[PDB]
Amino acid sequence: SSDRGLCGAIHSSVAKQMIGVG
Amino acid sequence: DPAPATTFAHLDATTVLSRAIAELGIYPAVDPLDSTSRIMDPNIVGSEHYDVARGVQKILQDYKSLQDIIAILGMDELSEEDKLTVSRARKIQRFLSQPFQVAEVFTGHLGKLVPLKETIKGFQQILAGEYDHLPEQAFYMVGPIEEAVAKADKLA
Amino acid sequence: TTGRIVAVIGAVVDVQFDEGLPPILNALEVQGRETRLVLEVAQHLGESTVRTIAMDGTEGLVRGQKVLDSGAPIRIPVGPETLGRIMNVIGEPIDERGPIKTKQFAAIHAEAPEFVEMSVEQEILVTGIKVVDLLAPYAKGGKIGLFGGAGVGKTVLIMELINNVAKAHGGYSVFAGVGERTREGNDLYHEMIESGVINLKDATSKVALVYGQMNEPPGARARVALTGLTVAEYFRDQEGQDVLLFIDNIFRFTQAGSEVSALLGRIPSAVGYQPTLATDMGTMQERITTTKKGSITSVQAIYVPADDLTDPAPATTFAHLDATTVLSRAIAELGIYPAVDPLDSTSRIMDPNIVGSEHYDVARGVQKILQDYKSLQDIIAILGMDELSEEDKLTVSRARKIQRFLSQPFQVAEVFTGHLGKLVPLKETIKGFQQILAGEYDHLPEQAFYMVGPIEEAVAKADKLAE
Amino acid sequence: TTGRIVAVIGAVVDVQFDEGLPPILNALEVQGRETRLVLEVAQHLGESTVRTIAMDGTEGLVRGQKVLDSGAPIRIPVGPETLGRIMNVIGEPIDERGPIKTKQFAAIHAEAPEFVEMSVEQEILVTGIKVVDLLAPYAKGGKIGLFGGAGVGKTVLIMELINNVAKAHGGYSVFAGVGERTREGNDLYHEMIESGVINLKDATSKVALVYGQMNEPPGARARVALTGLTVAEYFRDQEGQDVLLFIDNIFRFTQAGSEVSALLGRIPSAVGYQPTLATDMGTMQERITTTKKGSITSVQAIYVPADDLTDPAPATTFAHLDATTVLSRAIAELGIYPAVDPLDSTSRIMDPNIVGSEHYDVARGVQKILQDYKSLQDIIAILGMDELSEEDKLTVSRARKIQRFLSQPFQVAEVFTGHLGKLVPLKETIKGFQQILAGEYDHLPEQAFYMVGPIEEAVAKADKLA
Amino acid sequence: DLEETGRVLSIGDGIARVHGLRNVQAEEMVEFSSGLKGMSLNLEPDNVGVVVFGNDKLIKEGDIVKRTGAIVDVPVGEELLGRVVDALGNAIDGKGPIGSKARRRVGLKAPGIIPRISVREPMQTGIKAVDSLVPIGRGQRELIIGDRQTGKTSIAIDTIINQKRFNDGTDEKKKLYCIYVAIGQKRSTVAQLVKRLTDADAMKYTIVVSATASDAAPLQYLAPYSGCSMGEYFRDNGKHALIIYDDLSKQAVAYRQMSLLLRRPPGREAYPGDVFYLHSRLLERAAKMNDAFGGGSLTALPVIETQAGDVSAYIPTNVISITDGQIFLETELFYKGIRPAINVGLSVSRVGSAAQTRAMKQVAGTMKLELAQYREVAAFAQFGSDLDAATQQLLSRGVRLTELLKQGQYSPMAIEEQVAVIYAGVRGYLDKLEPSKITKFENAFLSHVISQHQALLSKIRTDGKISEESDAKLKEIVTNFLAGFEA
Amino acid sequence: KQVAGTMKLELAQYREVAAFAQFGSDLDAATQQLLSRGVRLTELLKQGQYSPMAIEEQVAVIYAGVRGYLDKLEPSKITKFENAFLSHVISQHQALLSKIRTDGKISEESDAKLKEIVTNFLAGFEA
């Protein structure tokens, strides 16, 4: 994903599917 | 207002109804954190009853605290934990609603009357997380917890 | 000349006089009482009847009861003899230490000094309290005011001002207890005997006391501020010296007047106050002042009904003041004491031509970063900390430290803090804050600056927190 | 007959009459004064005593000072000789040009036209101003709220309205300065002289001015509206005209009435307004209307206290408005004159059953295309103008082309600019935007439609651009 | 005789009910036996509501009250200059008699609609933010408004200190005599006030009319009018006066007192129905007269204190409505380092460009437009990392023009000096200079142009605008100066 | 006093830091510690009804908190720990309790015996 939050379910959606990028 | 304000101290149990709640479809439109009773005491109603009630009202208040963060940034910005208190509270708000035999014309449901045990076990089970997998809508306008389950399966 | 009580409703007493009618402000003496009961003339109603406010309970009065006119206003003892003594509204001693042997007395009602009597002199009064000395410092012979809502720290602050400034005072102090706690007065009496500023054995006492606390009726509370004031006045003029005047709490003068206002027949102004609030205040405040004959440094605790500073009473007071220390519940709630609001406290002498460009620049800076922070608060509270510029989120870390460094353990609040009292010299306060703004402590933890004296102790406190 | 002042308390004066008592609303002439002091009977206290509200200062009045009942309410001069004149609330000239010599006088208090005297029809009052007619059209005899405040073309619009209604409908105008600032009343009067609408040389004037300046007592400012209203009632009733009546401003009519109410010892109502808030308003407004003989249309400037549309003052007011002209600073800064906001300005008669199926559909298309042009301006900032679809490229062109055609040069400003003004007939307005929406002028340059009269003068402006 | 005299029926709270005085005029001044004055505000069927100019203690039931044929007027003239007087022109500065040869009534009608010409001539405050963005004109009424302790008195004081530069000149047209009315303030505050005027050698053309906190209610009520009448002496005899009413909140309060005690009906905030009238008849008397009438003027800077910045409160509502514009001050701007704390977006002057010289009008218009585009953007300031060059430049310009609007107290600027410094910003020369450094810059740059380029300062004035030649000299003075600064 | 002297200002500071650290990203050891303390102190001040506690027992509970001995114990077990700990000293250590109540203080001696009890009890509790 990335560093920056406030993009809704972006980071959570791949953390659900879960070295990381971002 | 002086009229109701002065009335509170004359009662042994209050049931405060809330326009906002009624407008969300929850009937009876009971405010769960403004209704009180003087027999809400572990030595009168038993520790089990008391513990579930306080648990129900705890998750409802924690959820109420989270509602301003929700109203600007919505569901997504919450930690995984808050999302769980949200999902459970919302299922709990819905399961507080009930079809009344007297209100069948407005609700479209046959009226329901739930034994005290069944009421306890229902909220107990929603607090232990037993129905985390069920969708909210299943808890809206039912009687015993078993009906919520049946409505969940009926939703396919 | 003799009068007769004709009506009694609470504190208000209507008296009829067949012959000579006592002029407004005269003290009347009620006959057939065990303790002396004075009625002050307030109105001429018409029909040889005068409307009076009572300086004590009215229980036991009967229509027809006799009232003498003393032929003059309330006169009180004024002089060296009032020192170490405790007086009430009407100059009676209330310390069970016998008569008050003065050569002369004085009416508690007097004209204010004229404009030609005014002084323009102003030089700093250092308090040893970081936030006052830094952002809104007091002047010698100035009118200071302590605004605060219920239980935010006025009295504590004024006790500390008394400790830090009144022991090391060459002149005389006056304390007037106006409508506050009687327990606080006992407290203050025995703390001063201990510190020596009152002595019960010789004539070295440097403080006079006058009390009329919330256990008294409205009239008593409505005049007791003038009694104190009048003791202050004598010391200013007839000796010329440096008078300290402490008043806790001046609001209680205004509240007392409102208590009796409807019985005096007034239509109420807004927020239920007497319509004569500003002027009643004016004719009273204007005696509290430094003149060419002598200097009064006056400090006044000022209650803020329902925490709302726009309340007629506190709002009308600001303008009678040279320095304002405003305390806030929101700030007290965080544990920041003294709970002084740095974005609402002011001083006439906060000006570079006076305190110098170094003091002024620092102070202004402290407010700048604090105000900048305040407008970022509500914003980053929801929009997340991480989105901030690395120079912005430094002004966040620095303001949060400066807020804490504004806090300070007080000598008189040891029972509240657990901490030892600390007095910070002026230069050390300027230097400490200068250094935080500079960035010299960005590596130090926030909580290191909390509840300490000078900048050293924040650094020392940082190590104790490192393990 | 003659009574005696028995009580003076600020602007309230009580008079006692030995014989016949002057009914409520009657005008009383106080004697022994250098200038005219009129007392309007407000109440009958009993014991032969009336309570009055003073129309000027009361400094100097003595208990016992004679007061002559005029036998009527306040009567003011009306008729054509008032045009170009400035009168005050009691009908005196304050422009220092000498008596207003009319063959009629009229009372400022009149009951509203009866149910039978009402026109059951809803007619448009063509202004000639394109934005208005097309989108927020005036009802003949309706009331219009004018929002904006300062520096938005407020005086120019007023002056053009006066001019266009004289020309196209042969009706005159009245201006009622309720709480007029002396300074601004001096300026407006001269601005009117310079634009032609007032003429001091001959008798071609089109407005009559009635000023109730801010430094006058409560009762004066409460009544000026009525004074001007009656000047207008002459033209409708005696001459059969369709008249324009400007009220500036309607909020200060409310407040003035609130202050009167407060002086008469009455209990304030919600938010400290007079309890007769709605009736005070009602008896003045209902006079503004279409009779079978003629109509009075009123343009009323509104101030919204606290920016609160639910404050009793603007709430009560809105009940009488049939349309709003909104003048915006944003639009002015984009060089659109009149600075009228085409989205904010509404009309009750913007209804196909009143203005016609056709007039309806064009307005709603113009409204729609401008709304949809606002939707794209973000994507314009984001993707540029050349990442629009081909249908969307058009909406922008057309929208921008409609925006400018809503602008128009005013006659009242021919002096300041050198450009000839345009009163544009309703059907040409309807047609111009009708044809733009259809894309019958997409090929024409954007700038051809700017500051123009009818659609022919846009094609004329496009052909002249080398 | 109950026609020319009366007896006090009842006395209290500064109200004397008098039986008799049948021939008193409404608002007439009567005299009590002890020698205190009284104004007859209520004439009732069976008594006269008299308002007490002093202590009640001197008046008893049955006291004789006389009509002396008195006339509520005040000494008027140039002999009031350099003097501090009370609400009735009595000297209170201890310098003996006012050598006054003329008098004027304190309650008088404002000039009407006809005897005036449009507000045209500048009224230079010397405050950059004001002269540029909220410019006042001779005859206008311009409200100074803000919460407590926001810098309201300051705006007026500096304005008064600024006139020195015109009054010591030989242009009679440009001269401005000043009147500062202290209503409801404390004496010591007033004293510091006139000290600051004396130190700035400003007192010689200023009249201070002070009705302080312990002066009876009616005095505080008349003071604005008395002051107003003194400033009319100048208006009517071909001259120009500036009047500061400080403040009107407190005046209204004094009147509210009298009304309520006179038992008149209370309204919103317990103010009577004639409180708007009170203030509106004062402020209409400020005016620009035409040549036919002498061509003089009286300019009013009324002061209003808000409470928690409530501009919609009854009395603020009244004066905002009444005036031609408002200078709003804020406490948050104050502590942001924005001093004077003028809110530039909210403040207005409906007179506008009409009261600016062509010089200021030019650079002002740019600044005004550029700060407004800034205000459109200033929220993306501290949360803008990925902004386009265009909006990045709006901020940069915005932040710098903002710094150029900051100003030290007690140092008003000549108009050309303002335009030279606004020029620095509007032409973009400071765009690459650090915000924190701008005030330091301005001080050094201005000292330099007053020191070395007095001629150039002489030419920005004379020319009306900034010539191509002045545009050349500045382009070079700044570029080089700036390089020296950052070196 | 020995145990509660600075607690009040500590808790007001704690609650302000919880709110400011609500947007959870990396924090120093200083503020992590204050929060750890606060969340635990806060559970310590919870109490049922109709069983007011003797002062000595109040002191013992608070003691365990303020000295940091529960800093590493899960916050939701604090309540369960207090009741265990209390019911322990009431029977096993009436001598210590007796001494604190009579002396009205925690002497260097009591301090040593309290420390020893709470450490080894907590461990047993957390087994």
Ligand SMILES: Nc1ncnc2c1ncn2[C@@H]1O[C@H](COP(=O)(O)OP(=O)(O)NP(=O)(O)O)[C@@H](O)[C@H]1O
């Ligand atoms: N331009 C300025 N720059 C810096 N400080 C200023 C400026 N103007 C005023 N001050 C200071 O700000 C403080 C308050 O200003 P003041 O003129 O009293 O405004 P105010 O709103 O009239 N206050 P008050 O009458 O006490 O309610 C004083 O300490 C001034 O010295």
Ligand SMILES: Nc1ncnc2c1ncn2[C@@H]1O[C@H](COP(=O)(O)OP(=O)(O)O)[C@@H](O)[C@H]1O
């Ligand atoms: N400087 C201080 N340090 C620590 N605690 C304080 C301080 N000032 C006040 N407090 C707390 O607030 C309470 C109220 O203080 P007090 O001075 O009586 O308030 P006020 O006089 O404003 O009502 C005190 O009893 C104390 O608990």
Ligand SMILES: [Mg+2]
């Ligand atoms: Mg206190």
Ligand SMILES: [Mg+2]
């Ligand atoms: Mg001021």
